[PDB]
């Protein structure tokens, strides 16, 4: 009854950040030590919780949000951040309690000639609310005239490919991100630490 963290962290395919993936964890023992003892991660930040105290806590659900962004944007996956990722793609609440985990995925997500399969939302009329997920492809009005769903001058498609090439500087290299959220509702607490 081990929690299937392997399915999240070792997934072959990861989501585009605009269309970020959420995995619900339930009905399992969570060995958090496999994550925090690991040398596979370069970012491992926990807000208002320490992965060492999770080992003797029980939750109703744990959520693992995952996507790819470029290296320079990993700082945006934090409470109170602004920028295209925090504003238009994936937003943490100001009072976030959870962990942000990232690692360089240049060996998997970059290719000679460029991998263009990972997308982000470049334009939006307003900022996302925390944990909001926008997969809409409405033509974005950038000018003073309405688009009526037709692309043209000042009337843009809202998504854009990242360009990951293995020779990119680390700031433009792909990073895989996992965000862990811990939930305790009015239900039996089915996700427990080994104690």
């Amino acid at each position, epitope marked *: 009854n081990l929690c299937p963290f392997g399915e999240v962290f070792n997934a072959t395919r990861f989501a585009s950040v605009y269309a970020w993936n959420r995995k619900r964890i339930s009905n399992c023992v969570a060995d958090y030590s496999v994550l925090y003892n690991s040398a596979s991660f370069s970012t491992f930040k926990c807000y208002g919780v320490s992965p060492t105290k999770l080992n003797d806590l029980c939750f109703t659900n744990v959520y693992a949000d995952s996507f790819v962004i470029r290296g320079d944007e990993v700082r945006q996956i934090a409470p109170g951040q602004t920028g295209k990722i925090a504003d238009y793609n994936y937003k943490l609440p100001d009072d976030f309690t959870g962990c942000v985990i990232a690692w360089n995925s240049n060996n998997l997500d970059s290719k000679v000639g460029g991998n263009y*399969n990972y997308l982000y939302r470049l334009f939006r009329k307003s900022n996302l609310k925390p944990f909001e997920r926008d997969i809409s492809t409405e*033509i974005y009005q950038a000018g003073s005239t309405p688009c009526n769903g037709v*692309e043209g001058f000042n009337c*843009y498609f809202p*998504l*854009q490919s990242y360009g990951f090439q293995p020779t990119n500087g680390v700031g433009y290299q792909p990073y895989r991100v996992v965000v862990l959220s811990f939930e305790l509702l009015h239900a039996p607490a089915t996700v427990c630490g080994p104690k």
Partner: nanobody, 127 residues
């Protein structure tokens, strides 16, 4: 990878209309845009029209704007080039191309080097 197979070419009299097809198979979920290009004997390959897979907005070269129409059937993974008001200057081999590259800017599909290419279909316009 995707495979592009074009059909519908042939001989037509000037003033007529013809529809070319390009069927896409393989990794069809990756499709961002489709483009049509043409190459006349002794001339360089020339962009004709592009269509974004999501939403269906179209971009045309000046030489066909108002005459040709590009459309796509997502369910059938097929793009169409409706060639109306055919002229002698339209005689060429027509090639369809696919890319998974998403640009915010539709006009970039006129100059983007695409990922996969069809075999080409001959269109000949009679006097």
């Amino acid at each position: 990878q995707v495979q592009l197979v074009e059909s519908g070419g042939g001989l037509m009299q000037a003033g007529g209309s013809l529809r070319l097809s390009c069927a896409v198979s393989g990794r069809t979920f990756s499709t961002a845009a489709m483009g049509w290009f043409r190459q006349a004997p002794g001339k360089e390959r020339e962009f004709v029209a592009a269509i974004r897979w999501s939403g269906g907005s179209a971009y045309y070269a000046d030489s066909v704007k108002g005459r040709f129409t590009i459309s796509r059937d997502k369910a059938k993974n097929t793009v169409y080039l409706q060639m109306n008001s055919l002229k002698y200057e339209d005689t060429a081999v027509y090639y369809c191309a696919q890319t998974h590259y998403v640009s915010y800017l539709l006009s970039d599909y006129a100059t983007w080097p695409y990922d996969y290419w069809g075999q080409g279909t001959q269109v000949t316009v009679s006097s």
